[PDB]
Amino acid sequence: ASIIDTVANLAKRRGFVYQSGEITRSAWDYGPLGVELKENIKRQWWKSMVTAREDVVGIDTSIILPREVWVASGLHRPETAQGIFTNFANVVTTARKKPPFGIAQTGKSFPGNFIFRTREFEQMEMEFFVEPSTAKEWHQYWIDTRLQWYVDLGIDRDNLRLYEHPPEKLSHYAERTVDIEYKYGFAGDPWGELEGIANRTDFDLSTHSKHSGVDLSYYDQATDTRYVPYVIEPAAGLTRSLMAFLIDAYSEDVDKRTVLRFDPRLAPVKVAVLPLSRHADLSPKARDLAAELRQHWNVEFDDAGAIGRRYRRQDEVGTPYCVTVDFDSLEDNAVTVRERDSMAQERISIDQVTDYLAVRLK
């Protein structure tokens, strides 16, 4: 069985995903784990792009926009970029930004290969407006940065690549386009697109200024000049990003153990509290610690079955850490922290546990 089918079956079994209305079929709902993973991915993207950057701001435009907007690109989005292009001047005005600077957005746009190609999906797109003569430079920068982003979130570099669009497959408005591709594992060609980084020149603002009559050019006072900025567009797939991170984290460990090697910042469940048994003495302290940890992270409490099977489930979903409360805990007031990948166990005082986990959960 292909890796893709295996990962999809695992996702369905552990509630990462459910067939949308099990009772299109390419429409998928995200179960608890799936929702948490998707949100973690979105938050990391937003933090790397918006909150961490002085030159990039955020925006959230309506799915249903005026019909003339898409005539330019009582009847009434296939992408999230046109809202950004239309609110360019509004952002320049309120946020007090000048090129080079970015406007970032995430949102839903409207088959097979599991969730690779779905009718309803979510995109994470940024429009970086720059003075034309720097576009190329900036383009490379982003091409690099975006790529490393995935690596920085745990994707094996060897499963990522850059595909340069040849002049024939380049759009008339696109001067250069470099797509990040991931080795999903499809039949035939196993590589697929994940995020497209395009140099759209000044086509978008020019077109919207012509069709709207509003001058969307920027005026640089430093030089007393006026120009239509060039646009660098990193457009990443949220559904495809989740698919890629999930696929890459999958691993089978002589003994065999299934484990999702999620980067901590992306795991749906950060910590699992596991009383050695259902004993009346262990469970209360365990639930107390679990409540303390829920004050910070999404936690799971499981007192069911042997400790080994519970460890197996928590690794199967990629939980970074497990906290075991044994009978010695009732005496020394310490718990056993088990790190997912290495399975290394270390006994630490309960009143420090949180900090011990914080540093490690990034």
Ligand X SMILES: Nc1ncnc2c1ncn2[C@@H]1O[C@H](COP(=O)(O)O)[C@@H](O)[C@H]1O
Q: Which does 79 bind (CB under 5 to 8 A by kind): its own copies, ligand X, none?
A: ligand X
65-84 positions binding ligand X, by CB under 6 A: 79
Residue ranges for the known binding site for AMP are: 118, 121, 123, 193-194, 235, 237
Determine which residue in the list 8, 135, 235, 323 makes contact with ligand X, applying CB under 6 A: 235
Q: Closer CB to ligand X, residue 244 or residue 325? A: 244
Residue ranges binding its own copies (CB under 8 A): 13-15, 18, 20-24, 27-36, 38-39, 46, 50-54, 57-66, 69, 83, 86-87, 90-91, 93-96, 108, 110, 119-120, 208, 212-214, 287, 290-291, 294-295, 297-299, 301-302, 304
Q: Which does 235 bind (CB under 5 to 8 A by kind): ligand X, its own copies, none?
A: ligand X
Kindly state the DSSP code that residue 112 receives in the 8-state scheme. Answer: B
Q: Which does 203 bind (CB under 5 to 8 A by kind): its own copies, ligand X, none?
A: none
Residue type, 357: L
Task: List the Cα angle 355/360/362 in 5-degree steps.
Answer: 100
Give which of 311, 233, 322 is closest to 270, Cα–Cα. 322
Which secondary structure element, helix H or strand E, spans residue 334, and what is its range?
strand 334-339
Q: Closer CB to its own copies, residue 23 or residue 187? A: 23
Alpha helices in 130-268 (DSSP H): 135-152, 203-212, 238-249
**Gaps in the chain (C to N distance exceeding 2.5 A) after:** 23, 73, 76, 110, 253
Q: Which does 194 bind (CB under 5 to 8 A by kind): ligand X, its own copies, none?
A: ligand X
Q: Closer CB to ligand X, residue 33 or residue 235? A: 235
Tell me the CB-side half-sphere exposure of residue 294, using CA atoms within 13 A.
Answer: 10
Give which of 192, 171, 281, 179 is closest to 240, Cα–Cα. 192
Q: Where along the sequence are the contacts to ligand X (CB under 6 A)?
A: 79, 117-118, 121, 123, 193-196, 235-237, 239-240
